[PDB]
Amino acid sequence: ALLERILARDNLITALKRVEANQGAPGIDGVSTDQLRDYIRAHWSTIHAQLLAGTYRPAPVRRVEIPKPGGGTRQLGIPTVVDRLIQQAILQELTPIFDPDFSSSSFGFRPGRNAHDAVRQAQGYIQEGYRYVVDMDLEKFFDRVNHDILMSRVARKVKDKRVLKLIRAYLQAGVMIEGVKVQTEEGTPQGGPLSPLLANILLDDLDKELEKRGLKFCRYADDCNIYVKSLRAGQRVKQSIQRFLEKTLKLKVNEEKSAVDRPWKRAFLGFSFTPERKARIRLAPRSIQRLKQRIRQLTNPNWSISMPERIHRVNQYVMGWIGYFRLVETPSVLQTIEGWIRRRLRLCQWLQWKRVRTRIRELRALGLKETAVMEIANTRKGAWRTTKTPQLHQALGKTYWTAQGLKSLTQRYFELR
DNA sequence: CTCCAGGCAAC
RNA sequence: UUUGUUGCCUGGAG
Ligand SMILES: Nc1ncnc2c1ncn2[C@H]1C[C@H](O)[C@@H](COP(=O)(O)OP(=O)(O)OP(=O)(O)O)O1
Ligand SMILES: [Mg+2]
């Protein structure tokens, strides 16, 4: 049956190679992915037997506080490499049981689906005429998952008692706080490979309810939003759907994040929309802000890196960044921040030549005319002031940065379309 | 298409 | 320090 199919050699090797590919930091017992094979070779006889019997209670997860993009802190729960290995093996077999029967409009944590699919569908509704969003998000979503309501929804498709106990064991598994196991009454650990699937299994009913009501929506994990014809209809469905998941499913809603605003006045998966009669996809203000922040630190202040290395490091971020944000239909802002990147990249180039003699040497070598060299080389104007002067645009223009290895943001934006 | 390494995004 | 799912981007071996 199922737990036999989970523990098949072929399934465990694919689960092994995943854990090893991730190179995650060790769980509570300090064994890294680098010695996962040698661990299982030594202890599989004990592990294999113990878990199929129903007795195996897994190792408690490790608590790690990390920052979230919103502002606050996220409590991680890192299982042991073997518990990551086992959870992966469960996930690999449970996926084809549940995933085909998940909603058409569910895009989070699923294979062959991404954030772009969720945004394009969301755009489709506002483009047709449903020009008001019912934005929503849940408070501490993974932490506030009730074990009984989860396992009930798991029990619908998987009838095997051995795996239901195994999944519950991982839910039950505690946290090790300075050498004591603290029991977990509610919540799946953020860090267990099986946790995202379990999250979708619970919210599967939310999709079916919204599908039953005949509502247009796009879900990506807890970030769910429903699109409507007017604000009255949007306000109506907001508190109605709020009470559904709060009583039937028992999950709290984040009222700070949840709102019934216009779609172009809110952010959905790092994107927003435009006021236009056909609503174009644009960058969210935070998406621009985070790019700026990352470019500001990559360009060297008290940091100290080689110049061509920084061009490679900026390329490596920006080319990766535009890989995701290519979905936007506004090259104007992309042209602006590309120019801004160059102005930031001139700040380092300018500060590299501190003395005027080196400035005169480098500008003359670059091909700038002798009148322009002397006019700017010995200026009282600040570094950020001199970066936007006619002289430094000429000497260190887009032509220079392209010829010295810098990848054009807007070029690759077009080349990815 | 599967596999390897480096990265970027969403949650 | 930093786990996880999922998707893509760049290079390499089949
Ligand atoms: N880096 C991550 N590692 C592991 N799980 C994550 C990570 N980021 C997000 N998740 C998971 C766990 C979260 O409960 C779930 C929904 O994300 P998110 O809404 O950002 O956090 P949250 O729902 O726990 O808190 P919040 O109250 O701030 O919305 O996605
Ligand atoms: Mg949330």
CB A417, CB A356: distance < 8 Å: no
Please indicate if the annotation marks A417 as binding a ligand.
no
A70 touches strand B (CB under 7 A): no
Q: How far apart are CA A220 and CA A216, in angstroms?
A: 14
Report the candidate in A315, A302, A301, A335 with the shortest Cα–Cα distance to residue A401: A315
Please, what is the angle between helix A147-155 and helix A195-213, to 10°?
80
A175 strand-pairing partners: A61, A182
First to last CA, chain A: 47
Could you tell me the two tokens for A280? 């174009």
Q: Which residue is nearest to nucleotide B11 (CA to C1')?
A: A221
Ligand 1 pocket mutation, candidates A62, A74, A110, A198, criterion most atoms within 8 A of CB: A74
Cα dist from A377 to A211, A325, A345, A391, A404, whole Å = 67, 39, 18, 10, 22
Which atom of ligand 1 is nearest the CA belonging to A254? Answer: 27
Cα A294 to middle of ligand 1, angstroms: 22
Say which experimental method was used: X-ray
Coil, strand or helix at A303: coil
For the range A8-13, what are the long-range contacts, defined as Cβ-Cβ under 8 Å and sequence gap of 24 or more? A11/A89, A11/A92, A11/A93, A12/A85, A12/A89
Asked if A202 and A145 touch (Cβ cutoff 8 Å), the reply is yes
Residue A337, helix vs strand vs coil: helix
Q: Which residue is nearest to nucleotide B8 (CA to C1')?
A: A320
| Ligand 1, pocket residues at CB < 6 Å | A 68, 70, 72, 137-142, 190-191, 221-222, 254
Q: Is the CB of A17 under 7 A from strand B?
A: yes
**CA atom of A116 to C1′ atom of C8, Å:** 10
- Alpha helix segments (H runs only) across A156-284: 161-172, 195-213, 231-247
The answer to whether the C-beta of A37 is closer than 7 A to strand B is: no
Domain boundaries, chain A: 1-101+146-186, 103-139+200-273, 283-415
Task: Give the residue from A175, A173, A153 showing the smallest Cα distance to A164.
Answer: A153
What is the pairing mode between strands A175-176 and A181-182? antiparallel
Q: Which atom of ligand 1 is nearest to the CA of A223?
A: 19
The H-or-E segment that residue A131 falls in is: none
Nearest alpha carbon to residue A318 among A416, A214, A213: A416
Count Cβ atoms within 10 A of the Cβ of residue A255 and give its class: 0-12 exposed, 13-18 middle, 19 or more buried. exposed
Q: Is the CB of A317 under 7 A from strand B?
A: yes
Spanning CA of A62 to C1' of C2, the rounded length in angstroms is 12
Strands of the A132-136 sheet, one edge to the other: A132-136, A223-228, A216-220
Contacts of A14 (CB under 8 A, 6+ apart): A92
- Residue A140, annotated as binding a ligand: yes
Closest residue by Cα to residue A56 from A81, A83, A92:
A83
The separation, in Å, between residue A146 CA and nucleotide B2 C1' comes to 38
Tell whether A142 is in a known binding site: yes
What CATH number should be reported for the domain whose range is A103-139+200-273?
3.30.70.270
**Number of Cβ within a 10 Å radius of residue A304:** 6
Q: What's the farthest any 2 CA atoms get from each other in chain A?
A: 86
